[PDB]
Amino acid sequence: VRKCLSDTDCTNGEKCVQKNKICSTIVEIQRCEKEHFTIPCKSNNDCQVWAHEKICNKGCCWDLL
Amino acid sequence: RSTDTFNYATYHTLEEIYDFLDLLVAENPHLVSKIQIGNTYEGRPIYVLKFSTGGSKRPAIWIDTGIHSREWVTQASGVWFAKKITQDYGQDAAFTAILDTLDIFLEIVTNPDGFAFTHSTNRMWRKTRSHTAGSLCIGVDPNRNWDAGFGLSGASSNPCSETYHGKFANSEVEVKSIVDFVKDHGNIKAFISIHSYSQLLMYPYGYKTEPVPDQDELDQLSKAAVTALASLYGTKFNYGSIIKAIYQASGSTIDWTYSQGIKYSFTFELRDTGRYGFLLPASQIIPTAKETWLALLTIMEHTLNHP
Ligand SMILES: C[As](C)(=O)[O-]
Ligand SMILES: C[As](C)(=O)[O-]
Ligand SMILES: C[As](C)(=O)[O-]
Ligand SMILES: C[As](C)(=O)[O-]
Ligand code: NA
Ligand SMILES: [Zn+2]
Ligand SMILES: [Zn+2]
Ligand SMILES: [Zn+2]
Ligand SMILES: [Zn+2]
Ligand SMILES: [Zn+2]
Ligand SMILES: [Zn+2]
Ligand SMILES: [Zn+2]
Ligand SMILES: [Zn+2]
Ligand SMILES: [Zn+2]
Numbered sequence A: 001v002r003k004c005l006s007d008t009d010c011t012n013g014e015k016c017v018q019k020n021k022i023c024s025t026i027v028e029i030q031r032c033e034k035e036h037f038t039i040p041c042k043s044n045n046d047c048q049v050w051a052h053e054k055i056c057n058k059g060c061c062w063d064l065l
Numbered sequence B: 001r002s003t004d005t006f007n008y009a010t011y012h013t014l015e016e017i018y019d020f021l022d023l024l025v026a027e028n029p030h031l032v033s034k035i036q037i038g039n040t041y042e043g044r045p046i047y048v049l050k051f052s053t054g055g056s057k058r059p060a061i062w063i064d065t066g067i068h069s070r071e072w073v074t075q076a077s078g079v080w081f082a083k084k085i086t087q088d089y090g091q092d093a094a095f096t097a098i099l100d101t102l103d104i105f106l107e108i109v110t111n112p113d114g115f116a117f118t119h120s121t122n123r124m125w126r127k128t129r130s131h132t133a134g135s136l137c138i139g140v141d142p143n144r145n146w147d148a149g150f151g152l153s154g155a156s157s158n159p160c161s162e163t164y165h166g167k168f169a170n171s172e173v174e175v176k177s178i179v180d181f182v183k184d185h186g187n188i189k190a191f192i193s194i195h196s197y198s199q200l201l202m203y204p205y206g207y208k209t210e211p212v213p214d215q216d217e218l219d220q221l222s223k224a225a226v227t228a229l230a231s232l233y234g235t236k237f238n239y240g241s242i243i244k245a246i247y248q249a250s251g252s253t254i255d256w257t258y259s260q261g262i263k264y265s266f267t268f269e270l271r272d273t274g275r276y277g278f279l280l281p282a283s284q285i286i287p288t289a290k291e292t293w294l295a296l297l298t299i300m301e302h303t304l305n306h307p
Helices: A026-036 B014-027 B072-088 B093-101 B112-120 B173-185 B215-233 B253-259 B282-305
Strands: A015-017 A022-024 A055-057 A060-062 B032-039 B045-051 B060-065 B103-107 B188-196 B200-203 B238-241 B264-270
Touching: A015 A026, A022 A026, A026 A060, B014 B032, B014 B045, B014 B072, B014 B112, B032 B072, B032 B173, B045 B072, B045 B173, B060 B072, B060 B173, B060 B282, B072 B093, B072 B103, B072 B188, B072 B264, B072 B282, B093 B282, B173 B188, B173 B253, B188 B253, B188 B282, B200 B215, B215 B238, B215 B264, B215 B282, B253 B264, B264 B282
Parallel strands: B060 B103, B060 B188, B188 B264, B200 B238
Antiparallel strands: A015 A022, A055 A060, B032 B045, B045 B103, B200 B264
């Protein structure tokens, strides 16, 4: 994980995901939004913004289903 | 008030659903009965509907909805399936043939305490409402409480976790009540436990990567089922083992039912893929139930033709 506050804190063309303040590729941002209506993550810690527990699963913040 | 005046296109309370159970039985007394399989942690009755055209201990299909209380489209779909069975039996030939050989058991509100709590206190509640010694966090994940891979990787030891497995397998009376029913019956041939959301149809295992012995048949049936589902509105479901399709999950229902020799053990995740998630608009209840019913029919027909 690389933490960020804006896109200029990221590397390799990655963007800052504002909801969880982590860097992610555009492809991963697009995939998590399109496939799962959610945000990318590297670990469970990147999914803590919801009071109702979510998990990091397969690169996106998932609900328990 | 009758089951014809009931509004299938809106979400209901526990009391309203329980009224629907009674009206359906009263309207169809020779097809439908209501069985109390237990009482919840907080003392509420737990009810299963039996749909049967006769016989003794006939081969049977079990369907449950609402094991996770926040998954409201599942309970709403279960109400619709119940009405659907009574509508089609004697009218639609194919379904008539199904119920002439098989019984169907349907548990619409599988976690009544959680369901009450989702209306009263916390719309996003998932778990049971049991108290746990040594914690102020309430509830056990009823889909981590079964005695198949219980307490292994794929569940949490933290009572505050959404996937807390409980102190021991079958600690939750809501789970134990089904266990007792299933073992006493001894002749359930398919067991389908319905969740939302994500648009998936899954088969064992959740707790390990080893392929289930009937993997290929179950994967073949899954493809046929999701194809039937898709025919109505084009809703896309993926399919596979629980562990491959979602994540590792231990002590889950269909791993236990499969271990009881119930070959056609399936779990659904209904609409949607996350746009609304658990808060699916009420205008999607009936379409969701309709398309899901097509998948259920595929499974029932396969069960019928593989006796
Ligand atoms: C409490 As009532 C009017 O839904 O039976
Ligand atoms: C068999 As009767 C009591 O429903 O007329
Ligand atoms: C045939 As009847 C409706 O009296 O049970
Ligand atoms: C028609 As078949 C492949 O489900 O036995
Ligand atoms: Na208990
Ligand atoms: Zn995905
Ligand atoms: Zn669930
Ligand atoms: Zn009518
Ligand atoms: Zn009412
Ligand atoms: Zn009432
Ligand atoms: Zn009668
Ligand atoms: Zn309510
Ligand atoms: Zn088949
Ligand atoms: Zn076959």
